[PDB]
Design a protein around this ligand. Structure first.
Ligand SMILES: CCCCCCCCO[C@@H]1O[C@H](CO)[C@@H](O)[C@H](O)[C@H]1O
Ligand SMILES: CCCCCCCCO[C@@H]1O[C@H](CO)[C@@H](O)[C@H](O)[C@H]1O
Ligand SMILES: CCCCCCCCO[C@@H]1O[C@H](CO)[C@@H](O)[C@H](O)[C@H]1O
Ligand SMILES: CCCCCCCCO[C@@H]1O[C@H](CO)[C@@H](O)[C@H](O)[C@H]1O
Lengths: 427, 433, 425
């Protein structure tokens, strides 16, 4: 019904947010795959060889039926140990990516919700303007049929009356495409929503912009993720750097191998029936000294990328400054506009009342009276819309601060009210 | 010239679409690469080594040589079998992408083509308006040069002329840039096209919206794709799962060897010239027991990706319902606008006539006659557009239902009549103004 | 303060560019990592495998120590000689992508600059319109309070006034936001900038469209990129075909090996207990004969990924042709518009006079005068806008041709001059 309920429905099922979670889940899951090369590697092998001879070996055949039980255990691989915390970091970037997506859904739903509401008001005023213009056309028509007004007055009215009728068409189509926006976001169709309580509508000027900036610094999400994506780039310098380092591998094994032989070749105590069993343990030290200049090159790029991710951060800061500062401007302009269009509506109404009392003694005409109606319901339109802009602007500030949430929608119920249906608000 | 014939000219050489064709062609070609590890691997290899013992092997100097054939045909290797049927899926997906593109080029030619006409109508009507203003200015200067009207009726009229004159410089430019956009779509410049036949024009009610949805639900190319990618992701679970399974390789070699020792402690019969030839047939078998928790971690990743692809499916669905329902609404709001602007042009006209008669007997002024001229050629414009919006929205549906077709472009030259041009009509700088 | 100076402060700091500079730098660097396999590989390993025994070979317990400087050097591997150039080409593709970023910054900085400038004018005229309407509301408020007009005149002006007040709020806000958007691109807040000099302002007709198209063909970075990338795709065809070739490989190694048996039946020959010092050296030859039609499949793909890279050029060509031709159209319609509005302002001012005249005698009413004010400070707003669009459109052409640089901004300094503040009023 109202916005909170609509969102609570929407978070329950919305693809874009769930698909974001699945990415976060996998990104956290993949840590275990990053840890695995540091854990015991155990395998089983089995061989069936067979031989022959045809030169010096003048036809010594044989065979094998071998079997292993191989173990690997890295005791010191720094590149491997580094690859784990890279994937842990990667999971962090994805979790911040996800929280960013939780706020986008709120904003997207609020907008979708207030787009529909606003669309209803544009249709209501269009209908109202239409009935106001039609009143004039109908009345002027009656006066004309008894010769009290010229034919011209009637033909000017009918013209303006048909402009609006076409306008109403667009407006009822726009409302019906707004509800379709909201159906795609929420996953549901709503015949009625909570209207805006116009009486209960107040305005609160925002916090100081330097205060808003000082906080955004701490809690903006695009900004934190940036500080994490850069930190990851730094760790990749080291993984590349760990190419200069040696490694140590424990490798234990156990196996059996029984062996046969053949025709007319040779003989003992040279060879035969064997049934070799053997257990093995081993430490493989292995250290790169110079492999083509690769490791130095891989560090350089990892560094250029770090320098690059350093730039994406300042970029992410400048966008936070732009958005916070421009959201401050925008909410202040909304409060200035609401107070403007309010005033406007009043004088638009009093000027219309003047046009009509003017039309009725000669100083004005039907075109003026009609033109007075159009400006009246345009002021009326623009006012109502400003209120919706102001609410959305309260939310965009919250978004820029990276602190948008359930409670900000919950708070918005103070200004909502009576249920309104969708077209027909006929006809 | 007309819409059918322009599309054909675009279809044959559109670089966007042929780029897709390559992507398709290549993605099918790779199947023969996804099969390659499941076939006889034959490799020939020779070498040469020299040794030199210098510790307790002082005076031991080998000098070897080898050849071989190799063969490592694989017998049971499920992952390779998998990646083959995977690459197949990747191609089937890539193809549906291509089939979508063919439908996108039909659509984007349709729009580009109708955008040009819309751009001419707007220029025709703005030019028309401009001369409707010029007659009232001209005849007013006449009435003034002999003193039948005051000069203020001349200077008021001159203004409205100049704001429409500017209005025309834009409407002109937009027709240029429309023909240029069209050229980008179809590689070609067009000096004239087939106009919309206003008289041979009729508007039909569309099918019921719930019928279109289920139609769209079974035919939508965007939808089909998302299903095959969810299905694809489903498979990659099973691929990740075959990491618990064992491999069974068949091997076989055939290689000479001539090792001939040298040195000072090559005295015994360990040293001599051995020329061991050989002929092998192997059966290597591998089966992993535990890899630090990898294969399970890989599977759990593959399952989250399946949820992902499953949610990408829902997205594709919600986007079709939005597209079908909205494109339904606009058909019904085009029809209503075509009817409402037809009526608005009748009224905006008759008003202008009474405005003039009114001006003529002093109950209105020139600034009313001119004001009514504007709302008229604004209604002619709003009307012409409602037609094109209807036709355009009619194609948006059939695209959403995955059945956008040449048959439909053909079925649109059943409303295209007399050819009209696309460049100047026509700068008239006198000046009076 | 002016566009040259502002862009200078923007070129030095702007992060989008500076990152792209670190992406060029790191594709040319990676040339070194493409070359490394043609160069001597050297390692060092210290084996230690203790080995126990059981079943038929029971009681025989060795344990080995080992060290060995390993060395590799490719003698012949063509697709290692080919992966290198393939990474020099991709580097060259980066450098062009960088050069495109250089010009975008110029266009961004210019577009941002003039948006603030034009935002100032719109706000300025809006206020001119406001004070203009206020006078009319004011003097006929007086003429009402002494019976010289009816209340209808006051209330008409009083309403059209309020429309402008509302408008002024938006116009002021737009300027505030427009400045912040300049602060992004630049990293600076600018109190005042060099305003456009409109007395000195002149419009030169462009070159011929066919000269621009011929010019674009040779110098437009989006085309050059597409060419280098197709030439990249061609070189990936040869890399695919390179799978049919032999692989010569020198290797060498010094090494040692302490072994020491310990146990029961430590009594025979074919196994040894040595301390070898091997100085192995030798050539290695590898040649594929057949791999399940892999290489052939990888060539038909590379060939398809070349008609792909080729059709992808006709796309890039149809794009530049559009941006060269349409932006030529746009600049011609700019010159036209600037002229049409120059007139429109002139004729709408003559008309505003004619209304205030007709009002004083009864041919035109209070609304007639007001509406003429509205038209006047709308022709002027439009005349002002048109001049900036023309200016940007000059750059959009230098952009399409792919030859946009500093000097084009330098040119846009004879056109600037007197400073104007960027806030109230
Ligand atoms: C590059 C990361 C900065 C921390 C390292 C200290 C300063 C860089 O020192 C570097 O240490 C490497 C160690 O082998 C060498 O290969 C480099 O040649 C050397 O310049
Ligand atoms: C954008 C809409 C255009 C119409 C706005 C016209 C403003 C009103 O203009 C009026 O028209 C009257 C008709 O009798 C004339 O007598 C007067 O010139 C004037 O009061
Ligand atoms: C009941 C104990 C499993 C042995 C019977 C084989 C049938 C179950 O299937 C097994 O599921 C496991 C999932 O952990 C996999 O590791 C095995 O590869 C798979 O064979
Ligand atoms: C029956 C089809 C057999 C296809 C296999 C040959 C495909 C053609 O590829 C050939 O491969 C040779 C390397 O083996 C190259 O030397 C030739 O230049 C090349 O033409």
């Amino acid at each position: 019904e109202n916005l909170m309920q609509v969102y609570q429905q929407a978070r329950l099922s919305n693809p874009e947010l769930r698909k974001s979670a699945a990415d976060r889940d996998a990104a956290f899951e993949k840590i275990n795959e990053a840890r695995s090369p540091l854990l015991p590697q155990l395998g089983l092998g089995a061989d069936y060889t067979y031989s022959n001879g045809y030169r010096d070996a003048n036809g010594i055949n044989s065979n094998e039926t071998s079997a292993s039980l191989q173990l690997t255990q890295t005791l010191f691989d720094m590149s491997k140990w580094r690859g784990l915390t890279l994937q842990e970091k990667a999971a962090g970037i994805q979790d911040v990516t996800y929280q960013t997506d939780q706020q986008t859904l709120i904003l997207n739903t609020a907008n979708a919700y207030f787009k529909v509401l606003n669309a209803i008001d544009v249709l209501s005023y269009t209908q109202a303007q239409k009935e106001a213009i039609y009143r004039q056309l109908d009345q002027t028509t009656q006066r004309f049929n008894v010769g009290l007004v010229a034919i011209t007055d009637v033909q000017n009215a009918r013209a303006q009356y048909d402009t609006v009728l076409a306008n109403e068409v667009t407006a009822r189509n726009n409302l019906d495409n707004a509800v379709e926006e909201l159906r795609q976001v929420t996953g549901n169709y709503y015949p009625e929503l909570a209207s805006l309580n116009v009486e209960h509508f107040k305005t609160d000027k925002p916090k100081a912009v330097n205060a808003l900036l000082k906080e955004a610094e701490n809690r903006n999400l695009s900004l934190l993720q940036a500080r994490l994506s850069q930190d990851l780039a730094r760790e990749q310098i080291r993984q590349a750097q760990d190419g200069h380092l040696p490694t140590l591998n424990l490798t234990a094994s156990t196996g059996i191998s029984d062996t046969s032989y053949s025709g007319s070749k040779t003989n003992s105590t040279q060879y035969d029936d064997s049934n070799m069993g053997q257990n093995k343990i081993g430490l493989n030290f292995s250290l790169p000294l110079y492999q083509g200049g690769m490791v130095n090159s891989q560090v350089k790029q990892a560094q250029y990328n770090f320098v690059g991710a350093s730039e994406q951060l300042e970029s992410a800061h400048r966008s936070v400054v732009q958005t916070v500062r421009s959201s401050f401007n925008n909410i202040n302009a909304s409060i200035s506009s609401i107070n403007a269009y309010k005033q406007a509506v009043v004088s638009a109404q009093s000027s219309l009342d003047a046009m009509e009392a003017g039309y009725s003694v000669g100083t004005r005409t039907i075109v003026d009276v009609l033109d007075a109606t159009t400006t009246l319901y345009d002021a009326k339109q623009q006012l109502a819309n400003a209120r919706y802009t102001y609410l959305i602007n309260q939310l965009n500030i919250k978004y820029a601060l990276g602190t948008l949430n359930e409670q900000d929608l919950l708070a918005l119920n103070s200004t909502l009210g009576k249920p309104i249906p969708t077209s027909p608000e006929s006809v």
